[PDB]
Amino acid sequence: MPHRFKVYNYMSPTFCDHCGSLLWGLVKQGLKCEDCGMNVHHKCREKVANLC
Ligand SMILES: CCCCCCC(=O)OC[C@H](COP(=O)(O)OCC[N+](C)(C)C)OC(=O)CCCCCC
Ligand SMILES: CC(=O)O[C@@]12C[C@@H](C)[C@@]3(O)[C@@H](C=C(CO)C[C@]4(O)C(=O)C(C)=C[C@@H]34)[C@@H]1C2(C)C
Ligand SMILES: [Zn+2]
Numbered sequence: 198m199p200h201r202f203k204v205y206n207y208m209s210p211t212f213c214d215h216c217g218s219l220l221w222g223l224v225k226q227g228l229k230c231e232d233c234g235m236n237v238h239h240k241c242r243e244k245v246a247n248l249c
């Protein structure tokens with residue numbers, strides 16, 4: 198099954214589970230999967246393996 202990513206606001210430092218770098222910024226830093234909790238940059242969403 199595909200992931201179900203939503204824009205998300207992180208309150209502690211969080212790394213993108215796809216590309217390894219920090220989700221930088223004060224708000225809306227990345228996307229969180231509703232179902233497995235994986236965190237990714239907006240631009241990394243289309244590239245992540247899609248087995249949730
Ligand atoms: C590839 C694009 C790079 C362009 C330049 C960005 C820059 O230098 O500063 C601007 C963004 C804005 O912070 P924002 O949180 O408002 O949103 C920007 C990122 N996002 C759209 C993903 C939420 O400001 C910050 O990141 C704040 C740094 C906070 C760290 C505190 C130590
Ligand atoms: C308790 C706490 O940490 O408050 C934070 C401030 C700064 C220092 C951050 O810790 C941040 C969490 C994220 C998500 O990864 C990115 C950062 O803003 C970032 O780019 C860097 C250099 C540190 C991160 C969150 C909040 C609530 C803004
Ligand atoms: Zn998922």
Ligand SMILES: [Zn+2]
Pocket residue numbers: 213214215216217218237238241
């Ligand atoms: Zn990434």
